[PDB]
Ligand binder design. Structure first.
Ligand SMILES: [K+]
Ligand SMILES: [Mg+2]
Lengths: 425, 426
């Protein structure tokens, strides 16, 4: 058999544009943790997960319990994660809404997934097979991703580093320009607009403008639940049939269900269906028609496959949600999406917004050609951890002065009167 | 350089089956089954066991030829292949006669996928040197509990083509109690399931009482195979009080099962009204059943069974596993998936006590059941090897028995000429 001998949880941080969202605005650096496991016969499995204080704490408490364990026994791993979290109680019940790493409800799922992806990568190296083959084989050889557009300011407050190439985007012109730039460099066939920040009427106009500038392109809008139902309706009337799907315009299962019933539009979510019980409750109300998968908080890659199959059973579409991430997450997203027959929609990604120098794998930033990630025959995730690069971002983590993400606190540096509201509009 | 399949061997067989009575009628002196052998370019062998009726074989055979030279990890390929093959095939079965587990035309893709899926995974496990369960995330338990599956039976098959079985007849409480005792003594089962909806329901109730009297603290269950009307089911519930752990399919249909539950609050189990994922959805909408008895053979294999277990957990339903008229291969595939599921709520179902000592296709003969359990070990894959001599022998008994499709209804007509497939009879 086989046994794990060394587990390394490494918190890191990397630069992030001043991206606007419903909560406020992104901080100069985004947190992350990098997982690396190693076996008695010298094989390495990589993992990537949330870096926020609560999530780190669990990862660090789990790691020490993993030495001398069979990497096939994911069931035992789950049991251990469940023991660790049960012993941590009580825990803070309100974290940052848009940062799943700070969600108490996802304590077990976040932690189990962090190591699950590493355990399977290990298994795949040992077998000399790409990761997707452990999951049942590639259904497709290229996974399409979408263009993740943000409204943004020119630069971060107090200029912590050198301003970015993109520049500000606060009008339909610059949004188009931002998209044009994205699609050229990466080849995306689908467009998503992060909304809930600028006035809704204006945010709608930015999508119309993308219709003209990019006809035949699937369009997605995501106010992250920051619009009331009344507003969600009025905006649906202006949008018509321009969207591929209408993602979390209004909060709550009941509000979503009422919105769909009244407008007929296909709704997607990553906020009202985030676990299996929420799926059960959604299905009973017909709240959503598409569910965004995310392996990071849904409890891993196999759990994501389980969700996809349930979505199929209940007549729901399957898409994919993202948080700022590097190469290990990207390959992980791609590998599981490549293995599920009914993931038609293009997966969301943050990759374009991350800097080329600040990647943690060998070979620099991974390639997205034709808006798709290629699934090669390289064993596991087909990735090697650049240790010098790791140390650099680990050290940047120590100096950034950030331990848990807060978009609300960050926007308060710009408007002092800013308070979290939901739904704002 | 990917590992690849070189050889596939589908092999039909028949084994002595007792005169076991059920809702539909009575077992034939023989019962059919198919054995799957897979081999890889590097000499590893994966095993399978499935349905042995003519139309199933025909499907297995059709798919068999397509398998050579393909990556045994690429199960998604294997699925697309089974679908294409089934699409190029007429049903060739009347819907009224689809009465046995897995017989429904809709199960075509699932039965055929499951047949090979097991062998594909048993293959992977042999190549990895790990037990199969490890492919499925690891063993939650090392022992899988099972019940004693009790049947009413006649002493012998009419115009029998061999010596009568050693069990004798079982048509009253005394003979049933004795039949259970035999099984409990031999195998150590800690729970009991009676195959019902065969004799008058008042008589069958009395047989449960006698079993409860003879064996206290033994959880008791029945499967009347939907052969009781709603009113009968209700009258029986009254007479039984709380003698039973659960009732499996006492009354037919999603609507009847739901109504029965509403009217009594009793825990209802099924392997009739929830047999696939669409049925699961419709059941959950009506709250028809509280417990799903999975069966990897028709649900689509081992990974699909895990999906099902997870779905039951999600919707607050109990899960347990099941297999009928099967050999050791099935028993192990079932046990292994049963071993990887956290939410195993009840002892599993097996026919294995009925299979004759001399009629297995594996080295060692009949697998051990100690303390009413099956041990999961560190042996690679299923940890089983084909006795090619026993294989050839039972393939010959297939050729000579003259049964190509099971028919408990025709078979019963030899004892009672006026017999029809009534449901619910009582
Ligand atoms: K969202
Ligand atoms: Mg049954």
């Amino acid at each position: 058999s086989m046994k794990i001998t060394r587990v390394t949880v490494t918190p890191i941080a990397f630069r992030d544009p001043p991206l606007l969202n419903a909560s406020g605005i992104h901080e100069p650096f985004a947190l992350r943790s990098i997982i690396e496991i190693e076996s008695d016969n010298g094989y390495i499995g990589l993992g990537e997960s949330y870096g926020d204080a609560p999530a780190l704490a669990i990862q660090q408490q789990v790691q020490s319990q993993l030495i001398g364990l069979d990497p096939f026994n994911l069931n035992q791993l789950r049991r251990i994660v469940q023991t660790t979290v049960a012993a941590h109680k009580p825990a803070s019940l309100a974290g940052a809404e848009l940062a799943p790493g700070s969600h108490a409800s996802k304590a077990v799922s976040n932690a189990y997934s962090a190591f699950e992806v590493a355990f399977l990568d290990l298994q795949a190296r040992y077998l000399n097979v790409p990761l997707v083959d452990l999951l049942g084989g590639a259904v497709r050889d290229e996974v399409p991703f979408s263009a993740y557009l943000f409204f943004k300011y020119a630069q971060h407050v107090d200029s912590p580093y050198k301003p970015d190439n993109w520049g500000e985007a606060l009008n339909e012109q610059q949004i188009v320009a931002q998209a044009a730039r994205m699609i050229e460099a990466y080849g995306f066939k689908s467009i998503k607009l992060k909304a809930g920040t600028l006035p809704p009427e204006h945010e709608v106009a930015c999508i119309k403008a993308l219709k003209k500038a990019f006809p035949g392109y699937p369009l997605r809008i995501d106010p992250n639940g920051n619009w009331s139902l009344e507003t969600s309706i009025r905006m649906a009337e202006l949008l018509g049939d321009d969207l591929q799907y209408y993602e979390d315009p209004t909060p709550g299962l009941e509000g979503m269900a009422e919105l769909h019933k009244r407008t007929g539009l296909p709704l997607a979510t990553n906020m009202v269906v985030t676990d299996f019980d929420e799926f059960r409750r959604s299905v009973a109300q017909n709240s959503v028609q598409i569910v965004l998968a995310d392996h990071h908080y849904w409890g891993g890659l196999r759990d994501t496959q389980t969700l996809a199959k349930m979505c199929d059973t209940f007549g729901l579409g399957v898409s994919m949600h993202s948080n700022s991430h590097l190469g290990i997450s990207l390959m992980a997203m791609a590998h599981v999406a490549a293995a599920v027959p009914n993931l038609d929609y293009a997966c969301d990604t943050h990759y374009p917004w991350q800097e080329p120098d600040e990647e943690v794998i060998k070979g620099g930033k991974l390639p997205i050609v034709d808006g798709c990630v290629k699934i090669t025959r390289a064993p596991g995730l087909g990735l090697e951890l650049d240790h010098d690069q790791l140390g650099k971002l680990h050290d940047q983590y120590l100096t950034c002065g950030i331990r848990q993400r807060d978009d609300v606190r960050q926007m308060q540096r710009y408007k002092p009167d800013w308070k979290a509201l939901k739904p704002r509009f």
